[PDB]
Design a protein around this ligand. Structure first.
Ligand SMILES: NC1Cc2ccccc2C1
Ligand SMILES: NC1Cc2ccccc2C1
Ligand SMILES: NC1Cc2ccccc2C1
Lengths: 281, 281, 281
C-alpha cells in the first residue's frame, strides 16, 4: 500500500467517524517513555488493524493503537506502538501514519527517543533538544522519500534547514528552567544509525570527528515526512550512555541498561511534555 | 528486465533500424540544461515506450525520448528525460540505456547536473569540472553494480581511478579560456547524496570536513556504468548555491532558486558543450 | 527463505545425518586463500544444492560446498564458496549458513579476506588482525540484521564492542612470533565498502581522515551474525595494495594484481591458520 492521498484519506475518514476528536498535536514516544499516553482524557483507542490501509505490525507483535483525546485542554493523537525501519518496514509504511495525522489536522509533532552520547559532556540521564541531524541512510539511497513524490503532500526536493522548530526548542528549555532541571538539558546534532546493532566503538569515534552530539536508530524518517508536509517538529533524546567514554574504557552497553535509564527519567519526561502540550502557541 | 547483453542488443537493433545514425558521443543533460538537444540536426526522436526493454517512466511523467543526429559535424545520441535513483528506479533500469549507448558505438559520454557548493570559494553560477567522487550509496551497499556481473560489458571489480578523463577536462578548460569565461570554471570532488531531500546544514558541514567540493543527487551511477564498459566521461556541475554559507547564515534553498540559476547559465553551457563536441579528438 | 530457527534446524539435521562430524570451529576463506580446505582430513563434501534451505548460488556459479572433517586434531566445518552482498544476496541468505554452524556446535569462526591498505605503514603482502570496524551499510539502513529479530539466536539490539576476540588476536600474533614473521603482522580497523567497485581515490582519502586502517567488501556481515548468536571471531586481512599511496601517485589497481598477492602469501597463511586451529583453547 502506497502512502498516497487516496489511501491516507480513507484512513482519516474512518478515524473521524469513530473518534469525534479533531487533533492539532501529534505525539510519538520512545521505548519506556509512553506513560503520558495512558493519561489522555476522554480518550478513544483505535487498533491499527481496524484502520483502512494502516501497516501490518503483527510480526513484531506488542501493542499497536492510535489514541485520541485531550491533554492540558488540547486535542491530541498518539501512536501507541512505533514503527522502526530496522524492523524491515518500507518507506510507505512509515510515512502513512504521519500523512494521516496531517489530514486529521495535526500542525505540531512531538517526538522522544533513547540515544547514545557522543559529545563528551553528555551523561547518562541527560536530555538533548535536537537542532539538526546527519542522515546516513539518506546519503546512502535509503531516504524515507525515495520513490515517486506524492505531490498533494509536499515538494519533490524538500529543504530540511528548519525541520526542528526554533521556538519549540526555546519553550522546552523555558519550562525546564521554571522547574529547576535546566542543568539536565542540552542541544545537539543527531546521527541516524539505521541499526539494529548499536554503534561500534570505532563508529562512535568517527561520529565524534564528524560533529555529532548523539546517535540513535529512529526519529529522522518521521521528521522528514512531517517537514515535507508542513508539520512543525520538536524532538528530544534521552541519553542512555556516553558511547565515547565506553569506547575509551572498553565497557559494554545493552538494551537492559538503556531501559533502566528510561525508568529513572520517565516521570520527569511525562510532566515536561504535558506542560509543553499545554503551553504550545 | 535485467541490463544484460541480450536485452541491450534487442534495444540497439530497434534503434539502428529506425534511425540510420551511428553515434560515437552520448549526452545526458541536467534540469533546465537541455536546450542543446533541440538543436540536434537531421534528427530522429525515438520515444522510450517504443524501444524494446527500455524502462517504464510514466509514473514520473514528463518527456522521455532518445534523440539521434548531428552536432558540429559529429554523430550523437541524447537522453531527453533522465532517470534518477531517488525516483525509485532500480540498478538495472538506470544501467540499460548506457549499455545500449555502448552497443550503438558511443565512446565518450558528456554529463551536466545542478549541485550545491561546499568549497567556500564556489559561488552561485560557477561551473565545476568533476575530477573524482565520494559515493555514499556505494559505500552503503546501494552501488549501481550490486547484483550479478554482466561479464560481456565489464569486470566484476572495476577501478574508478580514471573514471573522469583528464584530457577532456583540459579541453573543457581550454575552450573556456578561448571565450573569456575561465574565471567561472573550477575543478573538484563530487559527493553523491542519494536524495531527494537537499543536504541538511549539518550534513553540509560534515562534507566540508571530508574533502568534498560539491554535492548532488545524480551522475555517479551513470559514471560507474560508463566506466565499467570502457566509455570515457566528462561531467560538469552548475553551482546553484553555497550550502556552507547558507548553513552559517541560517538561509534556505529550494528548487525554484536552483532553476533560476539554470536559466541564467543555460545559453553559455549550451555553446560550451556544442564546442566541446565539435573539438573532441 | 528466512534465516529462522525452523529452517536452520532442517539444514542442520540433514548435515548431521550425512557427515557424522560435530564441528566446534568454522572457517570462511578469502579469494585465493582456500588451500587449507583441500587438506581437511577424513572429510565429507556436501554440495549446497543438497542441503535443505541453503541459498541458490548457480547465477554466480563456481564452487559451492560445505566441507567437514579434522584439522590438527580438531573438528571443523568450512564454507567452500563464499556469499557476498555485492552479488545481490539478501540478509537472510548470508545469515542462514552461519546460523546452521551455530546449531551444529560451532563456537569459534575464523575468517580471511583481501583488502586495501589505508594506514600509510601497510605494504602489499602484510597481514592485519582486525580489532574493530566501520560499517557503512549498517549506518545506512543495509545492516545484515535489518528485519524481524530471530529471538532464538540473539537479541534485538546486539553490542559489537567484543565482536573481535582479544585472546584469539593474541594467539595469532604469538604464532607469528614463534615462526619469525611478526614483522608482517599489524592490527587495525576495517572499513566495509559494500562494493563491487574498488574505493575511489577520494573515498580512500576520506577513510584516512575517519580512522580506518584497511578497506574491503566482505566479512562484516558474517561477523555481525556470529556475534549476535554468541560465536567468537578472528578475522585477518591480507593487504593487496596501499590505496592512499596509489591515490597520491595516480596509480591503478585491479583484480589481477590482488590475486598475485594472494598467491605469494597463500602457503604462509595456510600454515598459520592450521596452527591457530591446532592451538585454540
Ligand atoms: N510544574 C509542573 C509542570 C512541570 C514541567 C516539567 C516537570 C515537572 C512539572 C510540574
Ligand atoms: N566561440 C563560440 C564557441 C563557444 C564556447 C563557449 C561559449 C561561447 C562560444 C561561442
Ligand atoms: N611451525 C609450523 C607452524 C607454522 C605457523 C605459521 C607458519 C609456518 C608454520 C610451520
Amino acid at each position: 500500500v502506497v502512502a498516497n492521498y487516496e489511501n491516507a484519506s480513507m484512513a482519516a475518514d474512518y478515524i473521524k467517524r469513530v473518534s469525534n476528536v479533531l487533533p492539532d498535536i501529534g505525539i510519538i514516544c520512545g521505548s519506556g517513555l509512553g506513560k503520558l499516553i495512558e493519561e489522555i482524557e476522554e480518550r478513544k483507542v483505535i487498533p491499527y488493524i481496524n484502520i483502512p490501509n494502516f501497516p501490518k505490525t503483527t510480526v513484531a507483535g506488542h501493542v499497536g493503537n492510535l489514541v485520541l483525546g485531550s491533554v492540558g485542554g488540547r486535542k491530541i493523537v498518539a501512536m501507541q506502538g512505533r514503527l522502526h525501519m530496522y524492523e524491515g518496514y518500507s518507506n510507505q509504511e512509515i510515512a502513512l501514519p504521519i500523512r494521516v495525522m496531517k489530514l486529521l489536522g495535526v500542525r505540531v509533532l512531538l517526538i522522544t527517543n533513547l540515544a547514545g552520547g557522543i559529545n563528551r559532556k553528555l551523561k547518562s540521564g541527560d536530555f538533548v533538544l535536537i537542532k539538526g541531524h546527519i542522515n546516513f541512510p539518506g546519503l546512502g539511497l535509503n531516504n524515507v522519500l525515495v520513490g515517486p513524490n506524492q505531490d498533494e503532500f509536499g515538494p519533490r526536493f524538500p529543504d530540511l534547514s528548519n525541520a526542528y522548530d526554533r521556538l519549540l526548542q526555546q519553550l522546552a528549555l523555558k519550562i525546564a528552567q521554571e522547574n529547576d532541571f535546566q542543568d539536565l538539558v542540552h542541544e545537539g546534532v543527531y546521527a541516524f544509525n539505521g541499526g539494529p546493532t548499536y554503534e561500534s566503538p570505532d563508529e562512535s569515534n568517527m561520529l565524534l570527528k564528524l560533529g555529532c552530539d548523539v546517535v540513535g536508530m529512529s526519529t529522522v524518517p518521521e521528521v522528514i515526512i512531517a517537514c515535507h508536509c508542513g508539520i512543525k517538529v520538536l524532538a528530544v533524546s534521552l541519553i542512555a550512555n556516553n558511547s565515547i567514554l565506553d569506547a575509551e574504557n572498553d565497557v559494554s552497553i545493552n538494551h537492559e541498561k538503556v531501559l533502566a535509564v528510561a525508568e529513572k527519567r520517565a516521570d520527569l519526561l511525562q510532566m515536561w511534555f504535558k506542560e509543553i502540550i499545554t503551553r504550545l502557541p
